[PDB]
Scaffold this active site. Structure first.
Site: not given
Ligand code: ADP
Ligand code: ADP
Ligand code: ADP
Lengths: 483, 495, 497
Positions: B121, B204, B208, B257, B260, B376, B454
């Site tokens: 950090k 990409h 979100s 979500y 949805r 990431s 998982r």
């Protein structure tokens, strides 16, 4: 000499950039603000680095010879740089600079993450033995490597029409033995290598398949075909190929396979014609036993090019100036598919736009070899052939899916087996199938990008300007968002 | 908040004391039992503090010509997995203690989601509002240079990321500075930092990622009938109600979500007031309202409430803002059965104790807030791969699917004959849309969903192994400490 | 704990910088020949002084160690690099439970300015490992040293061209040998200069001859350079030279013993010697060889037959030169008016408080500051680093060459004189003196290192005298030394852009 050696072709590439840069300029400021846009376009245009070399070679007779060579790196917005090596007495610094810039824009239209580069060694390969050509290749590799003009993450050269896979093998072997000995990716310093040296399957026909896929992507778009007064698809289409080298032969064989009829084939020495059709396998076999297509039994001889022959698709597949302002109004084809670099002059482009003739540009159509080059470099980085660990996994999943359908139907009410074609795909599954899919996907994605750019700027059938604008937009965004 | 740092330290201490007894039994080394305990306690003592902290002082010339000395720091909590990974904060409220505690939190967060990085950090003690974009670029590029010279940035050493205070433009400057100077000879120089724009090697599905992780994390527990029977609920999102506190990027994505999949949003809380409707609030209608008015206040299909929505009658409560929300005073008034932490530290240890007594399941931040961390890792992998995900296989997959459907069609026509005609086997409208729009984000989302699935099963198994029940936070910390311990233990701790 | 562990000593170093920076500021803007306005030139000067003051980098470490009993222990350590205007950085390593980040930062800044006054091309650095060495075995101290070296090397806090550590009062040559051995075996294996990564090494590992007496010889030459200057000595009411001078040394460690030995050798009479446990005094003189032999067989100077015992320190003893040679606060505002010496030679860091400095200036007492006088070991550490870069001992190829040239010179004088005066009365033998013959026969590396140290202290004394005269500082040599150091560090930043 080639069209790629011509100083007028260099002026053409510069003019294509200037035309594209003035069109994007107004839209880039919308997305002090005009100083940044013009400033970045001024940085993009010239080559960042050009290296000129003088290196000794001991001939097989014992005498020494000083060899002159050069390599230009147009852009580093994407590293490594990428570009071929030409062995020709007709090379020049201006050639190497213009072809490096052409490679930056060609890579950008096909989303290949490399800056453009180009090398030239001022020698006529016919005047040297294979031993002398190896000496020249290995020493040139050494001088480029010491100055940052060859390396897996710096600059990855490739072959040309004047160079081949044996020379690329010598480049990789010299680099991995000396300067790049401590690099795990040393064999990724160059592409066009033989399979035994880290080469990729599907490299030989990469350019030919790219020409077929590029044509196919526009020929199956009803919007563009209605403007040319034609139906979509290759069925009931006629085509003519000028230049019967490897690109012309491959493009002939691929269009024929999809229903298109070859009405004429042009060569450096005369041309042949048959309105009922010319078989590519019969013509290839004839040329392999006689050295020329002249005298082909199922065709008539014509003294001159096939550029004015009545057909739907004209494919200039040879690197020479063919379509000029004098013969452009006599062209009877509705689609001109540039299978080589610079076969149409800017004056001919203007005539084709006035006559509603669609020219699929070289920046896009001739980028199949450049696309599979990227995949060969990736293969060497991966250190494994494509699909090696997933083909058997995919096969088992497919069988499990068919077994699930069979069991579900037997429960509800029945052998569910693969078709003869699917079984052959599963059994013969190898690296070339993934490279071919990767090339077809790239050509399809880039065609839609070029169509969207042409619709965004109201360019119509001016696909060349659309392709250059598409490339300049992408290169600009990398510089702009990097600071 | 210094109390949040004490919290993270306390979570480690609690987890380390629980694993200690079971770790000595699992040691299969040829040592005495006294040496096995010294090895376990010794390794737990090494794991707890940050291994390295770098403090920097670097000059910057302001746009007015005057010079300014900037103070910055970067802590690398652990190197059991290299490179280190962690964001960069630009704030006058940063401190060495903050940077150390958040680095340790990142080590444990990466371990629960099997992301092979140690925690790190960074903090630069400046208020970004007081600087121009040119000055922020100067600060970013110089900070990058000072970190690189000391082993605090590099694709295989330490890979920074953005924060709420920093963005993709700053990450682009970090990668550009590193690749131009110190990492010029590195083929992977652009993997030195994540959160980059797409034009600079970004991935990409990054915008979100945290909201999708909140969704998938909630989903894995809400579809488990064993955990849902304990809360008196049926599995699935159908006939479920939820409330979101914090309407930023994570709050909005979670709301989208969950809606949805059949869950009804009964309340949305914001920094300035809250809205409520027991019949439901549409996320698209609420997002469009906020984009044209700056706030959710005055929404026509909802009622205004002055205060947070933490005590609103719902099934799932989603604290999606980085602030202390659930404390010992309001924890007994919470009406939700599931508390989904879509932010770091929204629940105090005293509130956790109350929720355990009330049979309220808290899905911890260590797990539920790791969607961005997971993506990431995929961005770093994408830069190492030097290719976008699916680039060479989308057309190959597409052709295989059509060949599969053709094989079913031919086999059925062969079995049932031609009377009544052809039996077309074609993709559904949804499958056709998946095939046509197939891009990198779909593979990134798939890898994130696989990770959250998982890791949920791993946390459930850890909670069942130590009989922790609904104490998923302790189960996640114990799961993280077990993994970090095994890396140190199986590597040796003296060269 | 030492004076170097004291937070008030760190405030002192900060105050010395602030005082020096405000004095140079006005003269620096005048010397700026850049194409800027007279308002923008003040921004550059103040801006650069603001960059110089704080430490650029501080590394905090946590590393494991397996004790000899099998149990693990987490060791806390730090290293600050104050400045990189000159690379590598240079600075000692302290093993003490009294170390802190503030200590390591202040001592790194002190080392930047100390190197600048003696023209040693290194930025300041300082490390500390928070352990009491008495609680560890030699095997555990080796483990701590080797692991600390590894953690510094991976982060750019040790390397021949990056940061070159050194020993302290708490560390020694065996620990330095372990640092060099660990670095050369692992991170710096491919570096031809790996052994130059640290100084204070044993001779068998690349150490330099003349290192043990370095600090003491620097104190002697530093005192010598001012005591020979008649201008400064007339202000103190004294004659130049060490003859008929009396001195007292507080602290009988290695600096105290070497200083006493060299001052005595030049005619100065030692009237008193102070130690941690009491002090001795004799107005007729104390022999350094007799006192050293007594301490080596009894552990203390107490009970010395040719001296009288005194309970407290010797700071108020009637003498000409007072030499505080121990790292502790000795001269304060309470005892500064009782000091009878005219010269106070700081052979340690921070023995005089700023309040005592003010009293000494009012009483016309010359204080030769620690920034200059305690830089003998720093100078010879530079020479050890150079020796490792050179990969050869000093004088190795030129001693025999110099000897033959000297004999050829004496032979040339002899032949020329015999030619000029003839052979009546015989040959005119021109031979070396007994002292010159001994210099020629015993010529070794230490003689070149001593010459290098003497030249540095002489050149730096004149630089400090010129700075004191330029700013009209008089006997305020401490401010002159800090101003001299800040002027040099400023010029490196200013001319680099
Ligand atoms: N040679 C290039 N020059 C500039 N931009 C490029 C180049 N190649 C690709 N790009 C762009 O960089 C971005 C990388 O996107 P990504 O999804 O990672 O790759 P791709 O979609 O091309 O497989 C895209 O916006 C792409 O168009
Ligand atoms: N950050 C981490 N710290 C410690 N162990 C980790 C970390 N990330 C993953 N691991 C563990 O390391 C091992 C690596 O297994 P592998 O199959 O290669 O990866 P994964 O299953 O996580 O995709 C697993 O046991 C995994 O749980
Ligand atoms: N640590 C230092 N910081 C700043 N300047 C220094 C430092 N050491 C030396 N200098 C200066 O740098 C210059 C180097 O001069 P040079 O003749 O090479 O060395 P020197 O005369 O010190 O042996 C001199 O002006 C000297 O005063």
């Amino acid at each position: 000499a080639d069209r790629e050696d011509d100083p007028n072709f260099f002026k053409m590439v510069e003019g294509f950039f200037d035309r594209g840069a003035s069109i994007v300029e107004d839209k880039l400021v919308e997305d002090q603000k005009r100083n940044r846009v013009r400033g970045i376009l001024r940085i993009i245009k010239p080559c960042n680095h050009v290296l000129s070399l003088s290196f000794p070679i001991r001939r097989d007779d014992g005498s020494w010879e000083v060899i002159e060579g050069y390599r230009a790196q147009h852009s580093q917005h994407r590293t490594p740089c990428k570009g071929g090596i030409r062995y020709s007495t007709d090379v020049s610094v201006d050639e190497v600079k213009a072809l490096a810039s052409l490679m930056t824009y060609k890579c950008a239209v096909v989303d290949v993450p490399f800056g453009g580069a180009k090398a030239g060694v001022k020698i006529n390969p016919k005047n040297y033995t294979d031993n002398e050509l190896e000496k020249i290749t290995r020493r040139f590799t050494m001088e480029l490597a010491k100055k940052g003009f060859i390396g897996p993450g710096v600059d990855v050269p490739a072959p040309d029409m004047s160079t081949g896979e044996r020379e690329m093998s010598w480049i990789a072997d010299t680099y991995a033995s000396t300067i790049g000995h401590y690099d795990i990716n040393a064999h990724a310093c160059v592409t066009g290598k033989p399979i035994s040296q880290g080469g990729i399957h599907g490299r030989i026909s990469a350019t030919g398949r790219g020409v077929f896929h590029g044509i196919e992507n526009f020929i199956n778009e009803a919007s563009y075909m209605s403007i040319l007064g034609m139906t979509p698809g290759f069925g009931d289409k006629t085509f003519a190929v000028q230049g019967f080298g490897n690109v012309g032969l491959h493009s002939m064989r691929y269009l024929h396979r999809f229903g298109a009829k070859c009405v004429a084939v042009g060569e450096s020495d005369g041309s042949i014609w048959n309105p009922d059709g010319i078989d590519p396998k019969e013509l290839e076999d004839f040329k392999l036993q006689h050295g020329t297509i002249l005298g082909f039994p199922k065709a008539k001889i014509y003294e001159g090019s096939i550029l004015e022959v009545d057909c739907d698709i004209l494919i200039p597949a040879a690197s020479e100036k063919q379509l000029t302002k004098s013969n452009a109004p006599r062209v009877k084809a509705k689609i001109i598919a540039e299978g080589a670099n610079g076969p149409t002059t800017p004056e001919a482009d203007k005539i084709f736009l006035e006559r509603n003739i669609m020219v699929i540009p070289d920046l896009y159509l001739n980028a199949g070899g450049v696309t599979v080059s990227y995949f060969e470099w990736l293969k060497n980085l991966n250190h494994v052939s494509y699909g090696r660990l997933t083909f058997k996994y995919e096969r088992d999943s497919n069988y499990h899916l068919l077994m699930s359908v069979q069991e579900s139907l037997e429960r509800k009410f029945i052998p569910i087996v693969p078709t003869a074609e699917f079984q052959d795909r599963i059994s013969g599954a190898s690296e070339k199938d993934i490279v071919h899919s990767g090339l077809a996907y790239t050509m399809e994605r880039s065609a839609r990008q070029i169509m969207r750019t042409a619709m965004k700027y109201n360019l119509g059938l001016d696909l060349r300007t659309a392709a250059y604008v598409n490339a300049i937009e992408k290169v600009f965004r990398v510089y702009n968002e990097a600071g």
